[PDB]
């Protein structure tokens, strides 16, 4: 019916989180300010691969991994989270 | 001191005795709870608070290498008796 | 990682005692079954050597198979000899215990057990 | 009723209010018929015909992990970084604070002792706040 | 529900099952296998016991420290009944006499004292009552066994209306009265039937089953007032059954039909004995009843009991019966019986 | 040759007569032994030990005892190394978890400090 | 020092460290450690190809003749790679005294049988097989000795606990002792007795 929640998974350090951390400083606020009413949760650890997950309703789920991605590909990516609500 | 509860059954001197509903009476049916009847706290309840004329009062239960260890008891408050660890006896300055 | 072998030096010589032990125990059931005058039938017994032998049988080690070729023969040894008795051959079949049960629901209601 | 496990009573992870992840340990098990608690959610999400896809607490918290990578790396503190878009995210809601002063819900010692549903049922605790009221 | 009550363990020989059972004429056949089953569990069984206590001391093997507890009791007396039955969440009904003695006849066992354990069940506040009748008592049946035992199947019935009542066929064991009874018509002749034995159909079922539904049906509340019947998974006329008794015992059959008039006089032959006599005219009329078939009844697949055929567990009952030139003969070498 | 290459895991899962119910049921944990409170001494939080999580312990109903049923309730091993411990539960199929080494860090101890002439670290009382 | 302290036997001390001394240098393909205990019992700390070599020594040269295998002996320690300890215990009149020929094992690699010097052994080493699970190839009948015949696992192992995994009870359903898990009627009250307080000073390991 649509998207309910967004999880964004990342490390500090790695450098495969790299252009994930380049999303939140310059472009995750007006994100949400865009979706108030729809949680995103940035979750940082110190060694997981970069994730993108994404709870639909009643309960089903999507994986995107973004192990190594740039601003833009990880922008479109959400993008396509956020106008895919299967 | 013993007493009896409302299910018929003696108490022990811990508090023991089992209520309505337990089925675990039931091995005591045609049998019976082997209590003690001289309760310790009863029998020494009876014992009179010595008066002594010292400060700090020696106890070791009678009986030299009988009774418990020597311990020395304290007693300045005439609110409360020096009552010994051991051996519930307890004493009193008689000043 | 380079060790001292007790009989195979790979898995074919382990295999082949396997399959030795199996092939004994499948000519031996009928007597274990006549002299200790079970209850049960010649197929039953072979289920449960069937399934004695698929227990193991993910073991890629082996010294491992060696050692249990060696438990194998020695089970075979005090069974075809009448060192064991009824209860000891019967011991395999898990007769009076309550059937474990399996499912995640009625492990949840008879206890704590995972 | 759906009657759970204590704190003693189940491996349960914990967080404390700096981010670092921690388990208990098994002391004794729950009395009764009382069973722990996402045992009991599983086993009512298996009644429900909505079936959770886990048995055991290892795939609970490989469930965990999924939902937020640190739950499940203990005693280690993971820092969060991020104030500044948190700070501009704040400055768009305008808020009138109020004439109320900051008053703490905890003043005295007499307040300290009784505050959840374990220190309530305590007859130590009860002696603790009947001992500091005089 | 009392916290001493409530299950622990893993259900093996010292855990708590939660069952308190008062198991009546716990010294007989069922009542040995019963308690065996009870005690694997751990439940604190009580054990009602009339005869020398000598003849209960193989139950004290049966559970943990504690978990029996042996009793006096007489069957003409309320009191004991209440004793023994006021501390228990369940009462098991296992009271038989297959023949009448002096004190006793057919109804006082079936009639009188089932309705006096029920009566005293009822108001002692048990949860559970479980009577065991025959799949073959009726009121209009030709033995006087048959006839008590429904009459007081009737009164359990309107007098404790949530009582569990039982039907077994015809059970067999290692002590039983069905088998061993086929197996004992060597010494008296060539097993005389009544009219070839060809006219009777029968469906035995074992013991292990018949004591599994028993132990399913006090763990499950829905056998409060219900009635099962237990019944074997293959039936069998009773000359095949007979001639297949004697080809596992590997006995010389000779079968010869001695007619229904003056069976009944060799019946009367045996019961003057003030010993437990060795037949009667109620055995001859109950061998001779036809199991009867209850489809509207649910039996042991209504408790999740798998019930196991004849074939597997009549070599363990009738091993003992051998001659030593056939002790050890296999259980495949013998013909299977033919099924109706 | 008279040597053999085996580059497989461990396993002795099937040689030691364990059950299955007591391998992948079973949380081992691998832990130096935290120090009493009671008492100052270190010399039990010198080696490592692996324990088993606690199961059901009831009453029993003739006599109240702590009955179990439980075979590696009361199991506690002691090893030297983490290494080692570790080995030793792979090497036995046990699914455990390890918590590392918890030292008291250095302090800085000075008896001067107690009787400071400015600052806050002063003793009202000795 | 003198009423309650055990007197010292320098003597017994000085020999066995020249006989340890004469043994290493006779054998250096086999014995890797020489260590006189400080109540004067050496140990022959060897390698476990050398069950053979050595011992076949120790029984026929003319300055050792340790002719009688007293006692043969598996310490299970866990804490190690190879975890089983073959503690061999040889006595010889006509010298008269004890050595101690210590090697090691860990379950999977097999120890060289000693029937072939000690006959003695046949069932010492049987025992082993039984307790511990050490493997001795090319023995006469190993199989257990001292367990139930259909007793899975071997006691003495340390990972194996107390009470086992198996109770036997009467059972009059199949009229046959039976085998189930246990449920102990006490569970055993595990005592941790060991006082933190450091009890001997000379025998501290250095730390990490
Ligand atoms: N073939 C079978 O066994 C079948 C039996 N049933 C039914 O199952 C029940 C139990 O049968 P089963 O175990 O085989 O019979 P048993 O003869 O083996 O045992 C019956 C028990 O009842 C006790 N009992 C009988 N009469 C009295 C009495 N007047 N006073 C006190 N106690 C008495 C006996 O006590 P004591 O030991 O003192 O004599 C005995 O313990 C009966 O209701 C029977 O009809 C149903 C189907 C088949
Ligand atoms: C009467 C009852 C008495 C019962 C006695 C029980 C005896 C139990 C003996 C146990 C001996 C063993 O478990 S050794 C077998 C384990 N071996 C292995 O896992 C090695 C791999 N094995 C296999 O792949 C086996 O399937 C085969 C048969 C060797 C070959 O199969 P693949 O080829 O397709
Ligand atoms: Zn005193």
Redesign the interface.
Known sequence: LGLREIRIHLCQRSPGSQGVRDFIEKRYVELKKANPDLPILIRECSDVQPKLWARYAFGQEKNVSLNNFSADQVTRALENVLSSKA | GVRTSPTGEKVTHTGQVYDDEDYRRVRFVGRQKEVNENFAIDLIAEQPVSQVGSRVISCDGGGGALGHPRVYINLDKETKTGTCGYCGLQFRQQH | ??????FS??MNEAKRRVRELYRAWYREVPNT???F?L????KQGRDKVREMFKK?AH??????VD??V??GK?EL??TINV??????????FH????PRPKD??SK?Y????? | ILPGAAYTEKSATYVNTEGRAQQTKVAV??PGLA??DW??I??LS??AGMTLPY???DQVRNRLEEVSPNLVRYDDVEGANYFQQASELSKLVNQQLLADPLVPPQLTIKDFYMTDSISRASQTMAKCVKAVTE | LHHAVI??????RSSVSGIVATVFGATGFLGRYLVNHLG??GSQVIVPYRCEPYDTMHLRPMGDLGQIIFMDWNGRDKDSIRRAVEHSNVVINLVGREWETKNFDFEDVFVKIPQAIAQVSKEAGVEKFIHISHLNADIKSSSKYLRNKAVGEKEVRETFPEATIIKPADIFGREDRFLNYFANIRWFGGVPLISLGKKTVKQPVYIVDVTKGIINAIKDPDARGKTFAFVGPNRYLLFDLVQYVFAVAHRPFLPYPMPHFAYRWIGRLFEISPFEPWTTRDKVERIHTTDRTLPHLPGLEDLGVQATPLE??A??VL?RHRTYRW??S???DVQPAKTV | T???????????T??TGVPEEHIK?RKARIFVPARNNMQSGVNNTKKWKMEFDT??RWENPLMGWASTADPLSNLVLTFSTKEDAIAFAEKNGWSYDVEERKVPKPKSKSYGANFSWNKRTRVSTK | TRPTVRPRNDVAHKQLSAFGEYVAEILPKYVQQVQVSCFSELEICIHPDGVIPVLTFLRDHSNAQFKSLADLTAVDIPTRQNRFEIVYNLLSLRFNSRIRVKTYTD????VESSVSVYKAANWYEREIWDMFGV?F?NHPDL??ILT???FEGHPFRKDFPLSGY?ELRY?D??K??????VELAQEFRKFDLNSPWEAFPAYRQPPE
């Open positions: 990682t380079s060790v001292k072998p007790i030096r790979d079954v006549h002299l005058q209850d049960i039938s010649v193991n073991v890629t080690d082996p010294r491992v050692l249990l060696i438990k020695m040894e005090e060192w064991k008795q009824r209860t000891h051959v019967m011991r395999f007769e009076t215990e309550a995640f629901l949840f008879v206890g704590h057990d995972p | 098990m729950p069973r722990e045992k009991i599983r086993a298996e009644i048995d055991t607490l | 299950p622990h363990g893993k259900g093996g694997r569990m597997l567990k070599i363990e091993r002790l050890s296999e259980i495949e | 008279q040597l053999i290459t085996v580059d497989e895991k461990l396993d002795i099937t040689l049921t199961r059901e | 379950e999977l690699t097999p493997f190839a199989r257990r139930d015949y259909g198996v059972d359903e199949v046959r002792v039976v085998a189930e898990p």
